[model samples]
Target: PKVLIVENSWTMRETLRLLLSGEFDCTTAADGASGLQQALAHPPDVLISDVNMDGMDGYALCGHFRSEPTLKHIPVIFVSGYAPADQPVPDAYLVKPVKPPVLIAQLHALLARAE
Candidate 1:
Protein backbone atom coordinates (compact mmCIF):
# COMPACT_ATOMS: atom_id res chain seq x y z
CA PRO A 1 0.00 0.00 0.00
CA LYS A 2 1.06 3.57 -0.64
CA VAL A 3 1.38 5.63 2.55
CA LEU A 4 1.66 9.42 2.56
CA ILE A 5 3.30 10.76 5.72
CA VAL A 6 2.94 14.45 6.58
CA GLU A 7 4.72 15.94 9.53
CA ASN A 8 6.46 19.18 10.52
CA SER A 9 9.50 17.42 11.88
CA TRP A 10 12.06 16.46 9.28
CA THR A 11 13.58 13.86 11.54
CA MET A 12 10.23 12.23 12.21
CA ARG A 13 9.29 12.10 8.54
CA GLU A 14 12.67 10.66 7.61
CA THR A 15 12.46 8.17 10.43
CA LEU A 16 8.97 7.06 9.45
CA ARG A 17 9.88 6.78 5.77
CA LEU A 18 12.86 4.60 6.56
CA LEU A 19 10.76 2.53 8.93
CA LEU A 20 7.84 1.89 6.61
CA SER A 21 9.55 2.01 3.21
CA GLY A 22 10.56 -1.63 3.24
CA GLU A 23 7.00 -2.78 3.79
CA PHE A 24 4.99 -0.12 1.99
CA ASP A 25 5.42 2.50 -0.71
CA CYS A 26 6.00 5.46 1.58
CA THR A 27 6.17 9.17 0.67
CA THR A 28 7.02 12.03 3.00
CA ALA A 29 5.79 15.63 3.08
CA ALA A 30 7.16 18.35 5.31
CA ASP A 31 3.90 20.12 6.06
CA GLY A 32 0.21 20.07 5.38
CA ALA A 33 0.33 22.32 2.28
CA SER A 34 2.80 20.14 0.46
CA GLY A 35 1.04 17.12 1.82
CA LEU A 36 -2.22 18.24 0.22
CA GLN A 37 -0.45 18.90 -3.03
CA GLN A 38 1.22 15.52 -2.83
CA ALA A 39 -2.08 13.86 -2.21
CA LEU A 40 -3.60 15.49 -5.25
CA ALA A 41 -0.65 14.63 -7.45
CA HIS A 42 -0.61 11.00 -6.38
CA PRO A 43 -3.26 9.68 -4.06
CA PRO A 44 -2.19 7.09 -1.57
CA ASP A 45 -4.10 4.23 0.02
CA VAL A 46 -3.33 5.48 3.54
CA LEU A 47 -2.41 8.83 5.06
CA ILE A 48 -0.37 9.20 8.24
CA SER A 49 -0.28 12.81 9.40
CA ASP A 50 0.84 14.70 12.46
CA VAL A 51 -1.83 16.73 14.24
CA ASN A 52 -0.02 20.00 14.89
CA MET A 53 1.86 21.55 11.97
CA ASP A 54 3.20 24.97 10.95
CA GLY A 55 0.22 26.01 8.89
CA MET A 56 -2.42 23.51 7.92
CA ASP A 57 -2.82 20.76 10.47
CA GLY A 58 -3.87 17.13 10.27
CA TYR A 59 -7.46 18.04 11.12
CA ALA A 60 -7.60 20.32 8.08
CA LEU A 61 -6.01 17.66 5.85
CA CYS A 62 -8.36 14.95 7.06
CA GLY A 63 -11.26 17.35 6.69
CA HIS A 64 -10.34 17.84 3.08
CA PHE A 65 -10.28 14.13 2.57
CA ARG A 66 -13.66 13.72 4.18
CA SER A 67 -15.22 16.52 2.16
CA GLU A 68 -13.90 15.39 -1.18
CA PRO A 69 -15.37 12.37 -2.86
CA THR A 70 -12.14 11.26 -4.48
CA LEU A 71 -10.18 11.23 -1.23
CA LYS A 72 -12.81 10.39 1.36
CA HIS A 73 -12.41 6.66 1.02
CA ILE A 74 -8.70 6.70 1.80
CA PRO A 75 -8.07 5.76 5.42
CA VAL A 76 -6.16 8.20 7.63
CA ILE A 77 -3.85 7.40 10.52
CA PHE A 78 -3.32 10.34 12.84
CA VAL A 79 -0.06 10.46 14.76
CA SER A 80 -1.79 11.98 17.74
CA GLY A 81 -1.74 11.57 21.50
CA TYR A 82 -3.88 8.56 22.22
CA ALA A 83 -6.08 5.73 21.05
CA PRO A 84 -9.45 6.93 19.84
CA ALA A 85 -12.65 6.65 21.79
CA ASP A 86 -14.68 9.40 20.12
CA GLN A 87 -13.31 10.55 16.83
CA PRO A 88 -14.98 12.57 14.11
CA VAL A 89 -14.71 9.71 11.64
CA PRO A 90 -13.70 6.12 11.22
CA ASP A 91 -9.97 6.70 11.21
CA ALA A 92 -7.07 5.47 13.30
CA TYR A 93 -5.54 7.67 16.00
CA LEU A 94 -2.14 6.28 16.80
CA VAL A 95 -0.16 7.20 19.84
CA LYS A 96 3.40 8.42 19.57
CA PRO A 97 6.48 6.40 20.56
CA VAL A 98 5.09 3.54 18.55
CA LYS A 99 7.40 0.68 17.68
CA PRO A 100 8.00 -0.44 14.10
CA PRO A 101 5.99 -3.64 14.41
CA VAL A 102 3.01 -1.86 15.93
CA LEU A 103 2.96 0.88 13.33
CA ILE A 104 3.27 -1.66 10.54
CA ALA A 105 0.48 -3.70 12.03
CA GLN A 106 -1.71 -0.59 12.29
CA LEU A 107 -1.20 0.14 8.63
CA HIS A 108 -2.17 -3.39 7.70
CA ALA A 109 -5.27 -3.12 9.86
CA LEU A 110 -6.41 0.13 8.21
CA LEU A 111 -5.57 -1.22 4.76
CA ALA A 112 -7.68 -4.24 5.45
CA ARG A 113 -10.66 -1.98 6.06
CA ALA A 114 -9.96 -0.04 2.89
CA GLU A 115 -9.79 -3.22 0.85
Candidate 2:
Protein backbone atom coordinates (compact mmCIF):
# COMPACT_ATOMS: atom_id res chain seq x y z
CA PRO A 1 0.00 0.00 0.00
CA LYS A 2 1.10 3.59 -0.55
CA VAL A 3 1.67 6.06 2.27
CA LEU A 4 1.62 9.77 1.50
CA ILE A 5 3.28 11.99 4.09
CA VAL A 6 2.83 15.74 4.28
CA GLU A 7 4.71 17.90 6.76
CA ASN A 8 5.29 21.59 7.32
CA SER A 9 8.98 21.07 7.93
CA TRP A 10 11.22 19.58 5.30
CA THR A 11 13.08 17.78 8.06
CA MET A 12 9.93 16.02 9.21
CA ARG A 13 8.96 15.22 5.65
CA GLU A 14 12.19 13.34 5.02
CA THR A 15 12.12 11.86 8.49
CA LEU A 16 8.72 10.25 8.13
CA ARG A 17 9.53 8.93 4.69
CA LEU A 18 12.62 7.21 6.01
CA LEU A 19 10.63 5.80 8.88
CA LEU A 20 7.95 4.31 6.66
CA SER A 21 9.87 3.69 3.45
CA GLY A 22 11.01 0.22 4.45
CA GLU A 23 7.56 -0.77 5.60
CA PHE A 24 5.43 0.79 2.89
CA ASP A 25 5.51 2.51 -0.49
CA CYS A 26 6.30 6.04 0.71
CA THR A 27 5.82 9.35 -1.10
CA THR A 28 5.93 12.91 0.25
CA ALA A 29 5.02 16.54 -0.30
CA ALA A 30 6.24 19.55 1.63
CA ASP A 31 2.99 21.29 2.59
CA GLY A 32 -0.66 21.56 1.68
CA ALA A 33 -0.51 23.06 -1.81
CA SER A 34 1.91 20.52 -3.14
CA GLY A 35 0.52 17.87 -0.82
CA LEU A 36 -2.83 17.91 -2.55
CA GLN A 37 -1.14 17.56 -5.89
CA GLN A 38 0.68 14.45 -4.76
CA ALA A 39 -2.68 13.12 -3.69
CA LEU A 40 -4.09 13.74 -7.14
CA ALA A 41 -1.10 12.32 -8.94
CA HIS A 42 -0.52 9.34 -6.69
CA PRO A 43 -3.98 8.73 -5.28
CA PRO A 44 -2.73 7.84 -1.80
CA ASP A 45 -4.21 4.96 0.15
CA VAL A 46 -3.24 6.69 3.38
CA LEU A 47 -2.27 10.14 4.66
CA ILE A 48 0.28 10.76 7.41
CA SER A 49 0.28 14.51 7.61
CA ASP A 50 1.25 17.64 9.51
CA VAL A 51 -1.61 19.16 11.44
CA ASN A 52 -0.66 22.84 11.35
CA MET A 53 0.74 23.64 7.95
CA ASP A 54 0.79 27.33 6.85
CA GLY A 55 -2.19 28.15 4.62
CA MET A 56 -3.62 24.66 4.51
CA ASP A 57 -3.54 23.26 7.98
CA GLY A 58 -4.21 19.52 8.07
CA TYR A 59 -7.91 20.01 8.75
CA ALA A 60 -8.12 22.25 5.75
CA LEU A 61 -6.41 19.44 3.95
CA CYS A 62 -8.98 17.17 5.52
CA GLY A 63 -11.76 19.33 4.17
CA HIS A 64 -10.40 18.79 0.69
CA PHE A 65 -10.35 15.06 1.31
CA ARG A 66 -13.83 15.09 2.79
CA SER A 67 -15.22 16.66 -0.38
CA GLU A 68 -13.50 14.29 -2.74
CA PRO A 69 -15.19 10.92 -3.29
CA THR A 70 -12.10 9.10 -4.43
CA LEU A 71 -10.13 10.09 -1.31
CA LYS A 72 -12.75 9.75 1.40
CA HIS A 73 -11.84 6.11 1.90
CA ILE A 74 -8.19 6.99 2.39
CA PRO A 75 -7.29 7.13 6.04
CA VAL A 76 -5.58 10.29 7.31
CA ILE A 77 -3.26 10.44 10.27
CA PHE A 78 -2.75 14.01 11.42
CA VAL A 79 0.22 14.72 13.69
CA SER A 80 1.25 17.90 15.48
CA GLY A 81 2.98 19.31 18.54
CA TYR A 82 -0.39 19.43 20.28
CA ALA A 83 -3.27 17.05 19.62
CA PRO A 84 -6.53 18.76 18.82
CA ALA A 85 -8.86 19.88 21.60
CA ASP A 86 -12.48 19.83 20.36
CA GLN A 87 -12.14 19.43 16.66
CA PRO A 88 -12.61 16.70 14.08
CA VAL A 89 -9.77 14.31 13.31
CA PRO A 90 -8.90 11.44 11.05
CA ASP A 91 -8.38 7.78 11.90
CA ALA A 92 -5.03 8.16 13.66
CA TYR A 93 -3.89 11.34 15.45
CA LEU A 94 -0.36 11.57 16.75
CA VAL A 95 1.27 14.33 18.75
CA LYS A 96 4.73 15.53 17.88
CA PRO A 97 8.11 14.42 18.08
CA VAL A 98 6.59 11.60 16.02
CA LYS A 99 8.81 8.65 16.73
CA PRO A 100 9.91 5.56 14.86
CA PRO A 101 7.83 2.67 16.12
CA VAL A 102 4.79 4.80 16.88
CA LEU A 103 4.26 5.88 13.30
CA ILE A 104 4.75 2.41 11.88
CA ALA A 105 1.69 1.02 13.60
CA GLN A 106 -0.69 3.24 11.65
CA LEU A 107 -0.36 1.17 8.49
CA HIS A 108 -0.94 -2.10 10.29
CA ALA A 109 -4.06 -0.62 11.78
CA LEU A 110 -5.13 1.28 8.69
CA LEU A 111 -4.12 -1.42 6.22
CA ALA A 112 -7.36 -3.29 6.25
CA ARG A 113 -9.20 -0.10 5.45
CA ALA A 114 -7.33 0.12 2.19
CA GLU A 115 -8.63 -3.30 1.26
Candidate 3:
Protein backbone atom coordinates (compact mmCIF):
# COMPACT_ATOMS: atom_id res chain seq x y z
CA PRO A 1 0.00 0.00 0.00
CA LYS A 2 1.04 3.58 -0.57
CA VAL A 3 1.86 6.01 2.26
CA LEU A 4 1.87 9.78 1.82
CA ILE A 5 4.54 11.67 3.79
CA VAL A 6 4.10 15.43 3.99
CA GLU A 7 7.13 17.34 5.19
CA ASN A 8 8.91 20.57 4.33
CA SER A 9 12.47 19.60 5.14
CA TRP A 10 14.23 17.59 2.48
CA THR A 11 16.43 15.74 4.95
CA MET A 12 13.58 14.72 7.19
CA ARG A 13 11.45 13.70 4.22
CA GLU A 14 14.23 11.61 2.72
CA THR A 15 15.03 10.02 6.05
CA LEU A 16 11.45 8.88 6.48
CA ARG A 17 11.29 7.67 2.91
CA LEU A 18 14.38 5.57 3.39
CA LEU A 19 13.11 4.14 6.63
CA LEU A 20 9.73 3.15 5.24
CA SER A 21 10.92 2.15 1.79
CA GLY A 22 11.35 -1.46 2.74
CA GLU A 23 7.85 -1.96 4.11
CA PHE A 24 5.63 0.37 2.09
CA ASP A 25 5.15 2.30 -1.10
CA CYS A 26 5.93 5.86 0.03
CA THR A 27 5.08 9.11 -1.75
CA THR A 28 6.22 12.55 -0.58
CA ALA A 29 4.88 16.14 -0.69
CA ALA A 30 6.88 19.20 0.29
CA ASP A 31 4.21 21.43 1.80
CA GLY A 32 0.87 21.02 3.54
CA ALA A 33 -1.30 22.59 0.84
CA SER A 34 0.13 20.52 -1.97
CA GLY A 35 0.17 17.52 0.29
CA LEU A 36 -3.53 17.76 0.85
CA GLN A 37 -4.18 18.31 -2.82
CA GLN A 38 -2.15 15.27 -3.78
CA ALA A 39 -3.81 13.22 -1.08
CA LEU A 40 -7.25 14.21 -2.29
CA ALA A 41 -6.28 13.48 -5.85
CA HIS A 42 -4.54 10.21 -5.07
CA PRO A 43 -5.64 8.49 -1.92
CA PRO A 44 -3.13 6.50 0.13
CA ASP A 45 -3.36 3.67 2.59
CA VAL A 46 -1.69 5.80 5.28
CA LEU A 47 -1.02 9.51 5.79
CA ILE A 48 2.04 10.56 7.83
CA SER A 49 2.89 14.24 8.17
CA ASP A 50 4.86 16.74 10.16
CA VAL A 51 3.02 19.38 12.19
CA ASN A 52 5.37 22.23 11.30
CA MET A 53 5.64 23.30 7.66
CA ASP A 54 5.83 26.45 5.51
CA GLY A 55 2.29 26.24 4.14
CA MET A 56 -1.00 25.13 5.72
CA ASP A 57 0.78 23.00 8.37
CA GLY A 58 -0.20 19.69 9.84
CA TYR A 59 -2.95 20.84 12.21
CA ALA A 60 -4.83 22.50 9.40
CA LEU A 61 -4.19 19.54 7.15
CA CYS A 62 -5.59 17.16 9.74
CA GLY A 63 -8.71 19.27 10.13
CA HIS A 64 -9.12 19.43 6.39
CA PHE A 65 -8.81 15.69 6.10
CA ARG A 66 -11.38 15.10 8.81
CA SER A 67 -13.80 17.56 7.22
CA GLU A 68 -13.57 16.09 3.74
CA PRO A 69 -15.90 13.13 3.27
CA THR A 70 -13.69 11.26 0.84
CA LEU A 71 -10.56 11.70 2.96
CA LYS A 72 -11.96 11.53 6.47
CA HIS A 73 -11.68 7.75 6.77
CA ILE A 74 -7.95 7.80 6.03
CA PRO A 75 -5.73 7.54 9.12
CA VAL A 76 -3.47 10.55 9.70
CA ILE A 77 -0.38 10.22 11.85
CA PHE A 78 1.24 13.46 12.97
CA VAL A 79 4.99 13.50 13.55
CA SER A 80 6.07 16.80 15.03
CA GLY A 81 8.73 18.65 16.93
CA TYR A 82 6.22 20.89 18.67
CA ALA A 83 3.19 18.73 19.42
CA PRO A 84 2.19 19.50 23.00
CA ALA A 85 1.52 16.78 25.52
CA ASP A 86 -1.35 18.75 27.04
CA GLN A 87 -3.17 19.13 23.76
CA PRO A 88 -6.09 16.87 22.96
CA VAL A 89 -5.25 15.27 19.62
CA PRO A 90 -7.93 13.96 17.28
CA ASP A 91 -5.41 11.80 15.43
CA ALA A 92 -2.33 9.82 16.34
CA TYR A 93 0.48 12.24 17.35
CA LEU A 94 4.18 11.41 17.69
CA VAL A 95 7.13 13.38 18.94
CA LYS A 96 10.04 14.04 16.63
CA PRO A 97 13.10 11.74 16.33
CA VAL A 98 10.91 8.68 16.33
CA LYS A 99 12.33 5.20 15.92
CA PRO A 100 11.66 3.06 12.88
CA PRO A 101 10.00 0.36 14.94
CA VAL A 102 7.59 2.85 16.48
CA LEU A 103 6.71 4.29 13.09
CA ILE A 104 6.24 0.87 11.57
CA ALA A 105 4.08 -0.23 14.48
CA GLN A 106 1.91 2.86 14.19
CA LEU A 107 1.52 2.34 10.46
CA HIS A 108 0.58 -1.26 10.98
CA ALA A 109 -2.00 -0.32 13.58
CA LEU A 110 -3.57 2.34 11.40
CA LEU A 111 -3.62 0.07 8.35
CA ALA A 112 -5.17 -2.64 10.47
CA ARG A 113 -7.89 -0.21 11.48
CA ALA A 114 -9.02 0.01 7.86
CA GLU A 115 -9.67 -3.72 7.91
Off by over 4 Å in 1: 81-90
Q: 1-115, model 1: which lDDT tens digit per residue?
A: 8999998889999999999989899999998789888988888999999887789978888888877677878999889655553333538887788687888998999999899
Clashing pairs in 1: none
Q: Give per-residue lDDT, candidate 2, residue 112.
A: 79
Estimate, for each residue in 12-35, the C-alpha lDDT of model 2 and write its tens digit: 788888878897898888887788
RMSD of model 2 against the true structure: 2.5
- For residues 1-115, write the lDDT of model 3, one tens digit per residue: 7899999998999999989999999999898788889988988888999887787878788888877788888898999897575332445788988988999999999889875
Ten-residue region with minimum lDDT total, candidate 2 = 83-92
lDDT of each: 0.86, 0.82, 0.85
Q: Which candidate leads the pack in lDDT?
A: 1
The CA lDDT at 42 in model 2 is 68
Per-candidate TM equals 0.90, 0.89, 0.89
What candidate 2 gets wrong by more than 4 Å, as runs, is: 84-88
